[PDB]
Design a protein around this ligand. Structure first.
Ligand SMILES: Cc1cc2nc3c(=O)[nH]c(=O)nc-3n(C[C@H](O)[C@H](O)[C@H](O)COP(=O)(O)OP(=O)(O)OC[C@H]3O[C@@H](n4cnc5c(N)ncnc54)[C@H](O)[C@@H]3O)c2cc1C
Length: 581
């Protein structure tokens, strides 16, 4: 026989994270390869596992690997990546970057997939996953007309996929932030807790894909918060015995109070439970997600006091596990007309009943989806993916969909950045894409989901990659280190003016003074210390009428220091006309 086949089948069927890892390592030792080895490792693995069980898997993976956008793994063949997070979106990112031909290295905080809550899947995410061999690695995946997958199962899927592609992963390793390059010849590094392996800690990368969940975002990355009415979401998982009775209970896609008022009034007047919404997904567990307002959860002793800060309102000290269990179970039992039977809680990864309470009040969004940093010549492309990019709304089942799109758009970004386009280009393109995200839906995206790929134009109808231009995105380009001579020259023309001191093509010129010092020196003397707006408009008008130089920047642009490039373009004209003099 072939022992490798058993290693494979075992790897394939692994239901625990660390069993996936050991079954893969054994399969690897069986096939003269080591994990973490680019797409070449993938090629050997399928070279030696060309047999009945593996053949369709390789088939699907190959069909995707050879979609023109990857160039047979030559696109990002010179890119070095670090993905932060083994969440679905991180793994997905990992697969796209791996296929691109890049070196993918992934760090995950945890060492198991703990999460049982269920995610609604959009048609395209279903198809995608499918063409990654989802029913091979799961099989109970979206049976018939199922719509959703539990978190850890999705994690499992994409884990096996990323592994097979030779993505290098590290578990129990938290990324705390960046290490800038020590000197000109160096690269950007991660700071890792606790002990990074001496090779991971020394690993230099040029792309950072952060995919670390709702409440982690790197440095330079700034978040925009905005809340709605105070909402509190409770999710629950019950034992699913997969009995005939149990199976014959309809799901509850989304039953909202704004319509089913008599259902909810009935709930309340028979249970004291006052809800805004409830959802029931039938998965590995019976899953319920429901929304309440504060006064109900107080009245029922689910919460101990009326705390103003929501992060404290739903903290371990103020949440009463007893009551939240009884509340959850009561709602659950009512919405399903007891058809489900006497409900037992599933455990969380830690053994207490699977009921949690979350803050639903926020609609978080990050200002950008990417940034570029540059030191000692080393460029680094930061890009966000997942819950850390846009905060999903759980009832309306966004999460997976918008995260995967973010991940594709990140992979696209990376692809451009390998092709060697200017930082501002890569970023501008990414921001035009980003604009679309927070309002996406299957209805305002393309219909042929069968053919979705990295290329933005296969997914987003009426696509404008020019919505955002390199000029505006100068903010996202962070340089801590041809234009030499324009600065030197301006310093020369402006020496001697009392309040003027030229050091850049931004803040030096914010107050009008700077510009006047030039103009006055170039054409004396119309001739003092004016204002701020006054001086800027003085300079621009006078340079325009006297020197023959029309304004590139607005007076406000110059005053706000918003457009370095624009100011350089303006200045370069005084340079053109008067340098040889
Ligand atoms: C406890 C919990 C319950 C949820 N329940 C629901 C639900 O019921 N319904 C729903 O629609 N959505 C739910 N979500 C959100 C859902 O998981 C997301 O919609 C989906 O997982 C996409 O998230 P993500 O991949 O961006 O990151 P996440 O899935 O949030 O995971 C990010 C991963 O990165 C890891 N990580 C974080 N920081 C670091 C670091 N510094 N270094 C290394 N690794 C790190 C984390 O351990 C995690 O494994 C839940 C999320 C959580 C955390």
């Amino acid at each position: 026989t072939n022992p490798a086949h058993d290693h494979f089948e075992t790897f394939v069927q692994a239901q625990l994270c660390q069993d996936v890892l050991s079954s893969f390592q054994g399969l690897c030792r069986a096939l003269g390869v080591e994990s973490g080895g680019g797409l070449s490792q993938y090629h050997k693995i399928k070279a030696q596992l060309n047999y009945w069980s593996a053949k369709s898997l390789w088939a699907k993976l190959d069909k995707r690997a050879s979609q023109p956008v990857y160039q047979q793994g030559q696109a990002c063949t010179n890119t070095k990546c670090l993905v932060v997070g083994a969440g679905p979106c991180g793994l997905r990112a990992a697969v796209e970057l791996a296929l691109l031909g890049a070196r993918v290295v992934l760090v995950e905080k945890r060492i198991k997939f703990s999460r049982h809550n269920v995610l609604h899947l959009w048609p395209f995410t279903i198809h995608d996953l499918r063409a990654l061999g989802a029913k091979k690695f799961y099989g109970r995946f979206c049976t018939g007309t199922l719509d959703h997958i539990s978190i850890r199962q999705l994690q499992l899927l994409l884990l096996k996929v990323a592994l097979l592609l030779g993505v290098e992963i590290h578990w129990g390793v938290k990324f705390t932030g960046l290490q800038p390059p020590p000197r000109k010849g160096s690269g950007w590094r991660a700071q890792l807790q606790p002990n990074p392996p001496a090779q991971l800690a020394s690993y230099e990368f040029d792309v950072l894909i952060s995919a670390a969940g709702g409440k982690f975002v790197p440095e330079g990355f700034t978040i925009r918060e905005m809340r709605g009415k105070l909402a509190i979401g409770i999710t629950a998982n019950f034992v699913n015995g997969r009995t005939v009775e149990e199976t014959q209970v309809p799901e509850i896609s989304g039953v909202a109070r704004i319509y089913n008022q008599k259902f909810f009034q009935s709930l309340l007047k028979a249970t004291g439970i006052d809800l805004e919404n409830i959802v029931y997904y039938k998965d590995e567990t019976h899953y319920f997600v429901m929304t309440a307002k504060k006064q109900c959860l107080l009245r029922l002793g689910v919460l101990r006091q009326d705390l103003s800060e929501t992060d404290q309102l739903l903290g371990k000290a103020n949440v009463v596990p007893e009551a939240l269990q009884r509340f959850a179970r009561a709602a659950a039992d009512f919405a399903t007309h007891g058809k489900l039977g006497k409900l037992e809680f599933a455990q969380d990864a830690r053994g207490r009943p699977d009921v949690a309470a979350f803050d639903f009040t926020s609609m978080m969004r990050a200002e950008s989806s990417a940034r570029v940093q540059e030191k000692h010549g080393a460029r680094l492309l930061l890009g966000l993916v997942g819950d850390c990019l846009v905060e999903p709304f759980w009832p309306l089942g966004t999460g997976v969909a918008r995260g995967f799109l973010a991940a594709f758009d990140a992979a696209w970004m990376v692809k451009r950045w390998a092709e060697g386009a200017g930082p501002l280009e890569v970023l501008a393109e990414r921001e035009s894409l980003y604009q679309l995200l927070s309002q996406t839906s299957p209805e305002n995206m393309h219909r042929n989901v069968a053919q979705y790929g990295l290329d933005p134009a296969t997914r987003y109808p009426n696509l404008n990659l020019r919505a955002v231009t390199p000029n505006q995105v100068q903010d996202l380009y962070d340089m801590m280190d041809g234009t030499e001579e324009l600065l030197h020259w301006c310093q020369e023309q402006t020496a001697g003016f009392p309040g003027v001191h030229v050091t850049d093509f931004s803040s030096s010129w914010a107050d009008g003074l700077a510009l006047c010092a030039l103009v006055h020196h170039l054409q004396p003397g119309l001739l003092q210390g004016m204002g701020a707006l006054e001086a800027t408009t003085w300079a621009l008008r006078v340079a325009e009428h006297e020197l023959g130089i029309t304004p590139v920047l607005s007076a406000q642009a110059v005053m706000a220091g918003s457009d370095p490039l624009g100011l350089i373009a303006y200045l370069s004209h005084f340079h053109s006309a008067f340098k040889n003099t």
